[PDB]
Design an enzyme around this catalytic site. Structure first.
Site: not given
Ligand SMILES: OC[C@H]1O[C@@H](O[C@H]2[C@H](O)[C@@H](O)[C@H](O)O[C@@H]2CO)[C@H](O)[C@@H](O)[C@@H]1O
Ligand SMILES: OC[C@H]1O[C@@H](O)[C@H](O)[C@@H](O)[C@@H]1O
Ligand SMILES: OC[C@H]1O[C@@H](O)[C@H](O)[C@@H](O)[C@@H]1O
Ligand code: NA
Length: 386
Positions: A178, A277
């Site tokens: 990512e 994923e």
């Molecule tokens: O899916 C993209 C989106 O993700 C946001 O961050 C997430 C992240 O993807 C997730 O994997 C983690 O566990 O939590 C964060 C917060 O929700 C991100 O802030 C966005 O800008 C983006 O559109």
């Molecule tokens: O936050 C949820 C999951 O999101 C995925 O985008 C990430 O690769 C993981 O490491 C994570 O646990």
């Protein structure tokens, strides 16, 4: 040639939270170190090197055994995707991170081989952070591509490739988890990093496939880049809880969105595409999923104007505590994803094991009869077609 990504379906699980710790996957480890421990960087910094090595090595040793791999094979899987951080190849001067993970990745490759599984090694965290997520190692900033971070990433990747790619069990290796293009990762510089990773792989084992994340762009936007049949595999991640449109859907609309995704995106790619994923959860209720200290979109406590519903039931615990209708709707969502993602090149569930995050824990869903154990194990009609 290790695995025919062009012609055979990937059926996999992730070992999330094992060699790259994440607060939502093992909250107990972060909560034992207090409020400032919100990612692997801050956890190791607060513990210091000696105590960090003690606590993290206890986790590396206890969280995964050969038995995990045998259970994965018995569930009809052929793949395991294993996150590892750059710091496993030697923390940079000044990093709080501890190493030792390679000893445990070595066991995983042996255990996977014994169980008949392929391993997809995933470089899940890069110097400076490629995404600003806690799962990169350090949340809050995207500094990957500043300074010497990319050269440091390639140094780590080269060591990792040297150690593993000569094993036919290691069928594929992922450049970086990512990389956050919308978050400011430069696509041109990413493509250069991708080209260098390909050169590294082919220096050591041309049979090993290279896996590229789509960087949150539509996976078909990568058409025309390193299009090489089984050799180059795109990795797209499909989740319904990080988007305020998808998270508001009902179960029927969730299932429609999955089929639409397979038709508009997976079938449009000129390369094999794994959904590397995806999960059984349709909310962001899991404790610390949006980061330790942060709430949920679903209950109006994170990035939202309004609650859609309450997170008390779906924040913690195991699916045996839900109702028959809740387990049924979760299985309907999972079966739709299995069938949609097998239209293209297959799938890799996130994740194998948690401290209790309803819908996220494959080892839980399997035992509960929620997760199918073969393409013929279907309780509902096929929801997506060619
Ligand atoms: O899916 C993209 C989106 O993700 C946001 O961050 C997430 C992240 O993807 C997730 O994997 C983690 O566990 O939590 C964060 C917060 O929700 C991100 O802030 C966005 O800008 C983006 O559109
Ligand atoms: O936050 C949820 C999951 O999101 C995925 O985008 C990430 O690769 C993981 O490491 C994570 O646990
Ligand atoms: O929030 C991330 C999600 O956003 C949607 O645009 C995509 O269809 C999904 O594949 C992706 O997981
Ligand atoms: Na290999």
């Amino acid at each position: 040639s290790s695995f025919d990504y062009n012609g055979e379906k990937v059926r996999g699980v992730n070992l999330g939270g094992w060699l790259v710790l994440e607060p939502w996957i093992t909250p107990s480890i972060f909560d034992a170190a207090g409020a400032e421990a919100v990612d692997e960087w801050s956890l190791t910094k607060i513990l210091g090197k000696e105590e960090a090595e003690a606590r993290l090595s206890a986790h590396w040793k206890s969280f995964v055994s050969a038995g995990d791999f045998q259970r994965m094979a018995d569930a009809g899987l052929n793949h395991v995707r294993i996150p590892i951080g750059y710091w496993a190849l030697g923390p940079l001067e000044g990093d709080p991170y501890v190493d030792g993970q390679l000893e445990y990745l070595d066991k995983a490759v042996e255990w996977a081989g014994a169980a008949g599984l392929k391993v997809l090694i995933d470089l899940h965290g890069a110097p400076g952070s490629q995404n600003g997520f806690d799962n990169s190692g350090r949340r809050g900033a995207i500094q990957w591509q500043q300074g010497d971070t990319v050269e440091q990433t390639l140094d780590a990747f080269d060591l990792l490739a040297e150690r593993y790619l000569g094993s036919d069990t290691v069928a594929a290796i992922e450049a970086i988890n990512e990389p956050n293009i919308p978050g400011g990762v430069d696509q041109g510089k990413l493509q250069e990093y991708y080209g260098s990773v390909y050169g590294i792989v082919n220096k050591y084992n041309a049979g090993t496939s290279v896996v590229y994340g789509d960087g949150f762009l539509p996976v078909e936007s990568w058409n025309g880049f390193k299009t090489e049949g089984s050799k180059v595999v795109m990795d797209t991640h499909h989740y319904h809880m990080f988007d305020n449109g998808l998270i508001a859907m009902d179960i029927d609309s969730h299932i429609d969105a999955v089929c639409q995704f397979a038709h508009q995106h997976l079938e449009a790619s000129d390369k094999p595409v794994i959904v590397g994923e995806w999960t059984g959860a349709v909310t962001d209720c899991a404790k610390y999923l949006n980061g330790k200290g942060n709430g949920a979109r679903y209950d109006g406590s994170y990035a939202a104007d309004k609650a859609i519903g309450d997170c008390s039931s779906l924040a913690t615990g195991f699916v045996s505590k839900l109702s028959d209708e809740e387990r049924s709707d979760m299985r309907r969502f999972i079966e739709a994803q299995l069938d949609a993602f097998e239209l293209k090149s297959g799938w890799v569930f996130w994740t194998w094991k948690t401290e209790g995050a309803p819908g996220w824990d494959m080892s839980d869903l399997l035992e509960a009869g929620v997760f199918p154990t073969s393409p013929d194990d279907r309780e509902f009609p096929k929801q997506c077609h060619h």
